[PDB]
Every structure is written in structure tokens, then in C-alpha cells.
Design a binder for this molecule. Structure first.
Ligand SMILES: *C(=O)OCc1ccccc1N=[N+]=[N-]
Lengths: 213, 214
């Protein structure tokens, strides 16, 4: 099949920035190339058809061009509502094939996370499990280090992280880290803490509680 | 007035069968090619199959040849995807799309998609636990141990939307999902203003309203 090699895999650009996304076909596909935009939880939407034609209702800041087997999507002035994954597609032959996609995030200034820690509810303890939650709220960039310490001892392999999609209003991220222990193990320790390292913080921030206190 | 609406998705056992439907409105499918395109969780887009409803001519991706059958009924303006010998690999959101202008406009209209989950795990409703507070305070709900996706969470029945963060679900080692939903509020309102998270897990017919108190 004809392969569509799309680059970059991801990119961050500030609002107003001119953005360039590339897609190289493994062989001649003429102008039978399309560009799609996909926002989290939504269907793809057509932006460009026949290599260079702007689709109905799409903002004029989107454009497409072709040079041999290379196809270029350009966003002249990146807006906050352009946060999405972009896909090229050839349909010169069957099967139609897609590029791997390019995830576009909005670049903004550094923002330090607000950190919160939540002990397990008495309700959950009754069932025999203890979940401890650490929240990092509204920060940038996305890169952050969250480390669990129980009785000042580094705990590994017992926590999972989740990160929200970039916020449409302030372009920040939020993150949850959840530590799961049995009720038995939880009752064997006193100090529960999450230590957070982030570019927006001069030094690592620790939030903790003492079980039972 | 052009739209495509998929239906038929859900949770199904490996090795089983499932039929999806794609109802078209605002145009006649006899005029165009109809496609199925799928997207596995956290992955890119994969074309599945195509049909020309007028003569019933079909094409398939190698990954589904023999196992899947695409078909169409022009008198119902509807296309179908019959899925057989389902595998975990087939788990995905399935989209219906059309070729506009005999292909010139590419895939110009897509449906909203229908989620197909192929798994031997049973449905399970979530437990909902409070994340008690201790924009200066944070609180939330832990929505734990459910299967399959998706769940929905609102706060105060939609009255509270600002500062809410409902995190993507993560699969636990147990093979059950878990997520938290949090919101930041004024500390001033912690002892009086009521905060309730509304959790709906339609797959298990589970509905939970949990009040979060300090
Ligand atoms: C979790 O608390 O791991 C640490 C651990 C494991 C087993 C026994 C004791 C401890 N103490 N600590 N920390």
C-alpha cells in the first residue's frame, strides 16, 4: 500500500504562530490528498481536499500545497481552538491510507501547578482498599514529576497518572496521581506525601497528611 | 442537511459477532461510496472497508478481509458492517464516512462514531468515593472499578462547570477503569455550599449522586 509519512509527530506553537505540517507519500498520488482535523472525543473533520482546496466553512488560516510527493498543511495564525491532532490521507489507490497524525498543542508561558492531596475516604476503607490522590492543577508545560513518599520512603509501582487535555481557556494541563494500597498496608504507615517537581516551581513542593490525624 | 449516524456498537465477547449500521440523511447513498473507518484507543485512523451501494461492489482492509462484510440497502439509505470473529484488536470507535464528489472531496462527512469494545471482562458499575476538601480549595469524586468505558460526570447537575477537571480513565492492573473528577472552588463556600458529583455508567445502568463534604 502507499504509505503517508507525516511529520512532525507533535509540535507546540504559540497563538498567532505560522504552523507547518508535512506529509510525504511513498509514491506518486497526484493531488488525491486530504487533510483532517480531529479534536479529542470528536470525529475527524475535513480541512483540505485535492491537496490545496479549502473545504466549506474552514477558516482561511488553513491552506494546503503539493510539491511532488510532499504535501504541506499550513496554519498561518494558530488559534487556541486549533489544538487538535491533524491527519493527512491519500486516496489515489485502495486502501486509502492516513498519516500517523500530528498533535498540535498551544505553547504558553510557564505556570506552576497548584497541588492538593486527598486521603482515602472512610467509605472506601470499609471495602478494604485505600486510594490516595495527588492533584496538580492548571500547569504548563505538561512535563512534571510526581513522587509518592510513605513514611519518607519512595514508593514505586503502586501509582498511576492521568492528564487532562489542554484547557481551551488558559492552555494549561492538570494531572492526577493515584496511589492504591490495601487497607492493611495503609494502616501500617503514618505520613503520606506527594512531592511535585515542575519548571514553574523554584523547588519541589510537598503535600502530605498524617493518617488518622 | 447531510449527516451520517452510526449505531450498533457496544461490549462484545472475543470470537463473537456484531453488526453496525450507518444511516445517511441529506443525500442518497446510491450516489456515493460509503466507508467504514476505525480508531483504536489512543491510536490513529485505519480504513476498514468501502462499498458502492448502487452495484454493491466492495473493498476491504487486509486486517478484516474474510471476517468483516460491508453491505448497503439503498431503499433504507443505510450501510452496514457485519463484524465476525471479533478480536481485542478490533476494539475501536467505528466511523462511517462518504466520498464526496466521487472522491474529489475526499471524506467530507463523518458520523459521530460508535464504540466497539471486544473483551471477556464483565460489565461492572463504579464505586464513587468523595475526595474531601481540606479558587483556593479543591474537591472531587473518585470513580473507581468500572467496566467498560464510558462514564459521565457532572457537578451539581450541570450548574457547576467552571474549574472542573474530569480526568481520562486509566486501566488498573485489575483490568477495571478508574478516574477522578475534581473542581476548584472558593474556600469560603466549603461549609455551606453543597457539592454533588453526578456519575452515570450507562453500560451497567448505574447512576450515582455523591455529596462531597469537608
Ligand atoms: C509502602 O509503604 O512500601 C514501603 C514499605 C513496604 C513494606 C513494608 C514496609 C514499608 N514501609 N514503608 N515505607
Amino acid at each position: 500500500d502507499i504509505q503517508m509519512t507525516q511529520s512532525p509527530s507533535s509540535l507546540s506553537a504559540s497563538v498567532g504562530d505560522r504552523v507547518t505540517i508535512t506529509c510525504r507519500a511513498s509514491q506518486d498520488v497526484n493531488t488525491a490528498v486530504a487533510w483532517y482535523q480531529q479534536k479529542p472525543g470528536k470525529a475527524p473533520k475535513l480541512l483540505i481536499y485535492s491537496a490545496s482546496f479549502l473545504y466549506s466553512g474552514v477558516p482561511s488560516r488553513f491552506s494546503g500545497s503539493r510539491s511532488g510527493t510532499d504535501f504541506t498543511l499550513t496554519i498561518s495564525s494558530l488559534q487556541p481552538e486549533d489544538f487538535a491532532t491533524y491527519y493527512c490521507q491519500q486516496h489515489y489507490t485502495t486502501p486509502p491510507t492516513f498519516g500517523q497524525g500530528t498533535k498540535v498543542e498551544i505553547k504558553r508561558t510557564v505556570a506552576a501547578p497548584s497541588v492538593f492531596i486527598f486521603p482515602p475516604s472512610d467509605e472506601q476503607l470499609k471495602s478494604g482498599t485505600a486510594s490516595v490522590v495527588c492533584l496538580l492543577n492548571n500547569f504548563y508545560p505538561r512535563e512534571a514529576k510526581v513522587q509518592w513518599k510513605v513514611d519518607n520512603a519512595l514508593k514505586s509501582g503502586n501509582s498511576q497518572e492521568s492528564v487532562t487535555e489542554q484547557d481551551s481557556k488558559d492552555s494549561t494541563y492538570s494531572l492526577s496521581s493515584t496511589l492504591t494500597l490495601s487497607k492493611a498496608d495503609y494502616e501500617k504507615h503514618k505520613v503520606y506525601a506527594c512531592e511535585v517537581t515542575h519548571q514553574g516551581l523554584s523547588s519541589p513542593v510537598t503535600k502530605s497528611f498524617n493518617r488518622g490525624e | 442537511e447531510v449527516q451520517l449516524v452510526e449505531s450498533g456498537g457496544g461490549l462484545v465477547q472475543p470470537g463473537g459477532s456484531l453488526r453496525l449500521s450507518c444511516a445517511a440523511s441529506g443525500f442518497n447513498i446510491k450516489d456515493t461510496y460509503i466507508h467504514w473507518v476505525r480508531q483504536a484507543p489512543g491510536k490513529g485512523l485505519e480504513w476498514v472497508a468501502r462499498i458502492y451501494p448502487t452495484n454493491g461492489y466492495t473493498r476491504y482492509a487486509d486486517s478484516v478481509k474474510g471476517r468483516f462484510t460491508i453491505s448497503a440497502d439503498t431503499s433504507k439509505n443505510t450501510a452496514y458492517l457485519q463484524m465476525n470473529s471479533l478480536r481485542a484488536e478490533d476494539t475501536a470507535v467505528y466511523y462511517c464516512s462518504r466520498w464526496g464528489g466521487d472522491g474529489f472531496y475526499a471524506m467530507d462527512y463523518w458520523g459521530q462514531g460508535t464504540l466497539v469494545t471486544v473483551s471477556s471482562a464483565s460489565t461492572k458499575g463504579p464505586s464513587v468515593f468523595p475526595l474531601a476538601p481540606s479558587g483556593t480549595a479543591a474537591l472531587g469524586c473518585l470513580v473507581k472499578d468500572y467496566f467498560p468505558e464510558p462514564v459521565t460526570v457532572s457537578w451539581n447537575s450541570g450548574a457547576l462547570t467552571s474549574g472542573v477537571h474530569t480526568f481520562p480513565a486509566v486501566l488498573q492492573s485489575s483490568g477495571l477503569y478508574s478516574l477522578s473528577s475534581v473542581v476548584t472552588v472558593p474556600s469560603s463556600s466549603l461549609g455551606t455550599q453543597t457539592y454533588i458529583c453526578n456519575v452515570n455508567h450507562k453500560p451497567s445502568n448505574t447512576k450515582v449522586d455523591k455529596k462531597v463534604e469537608p
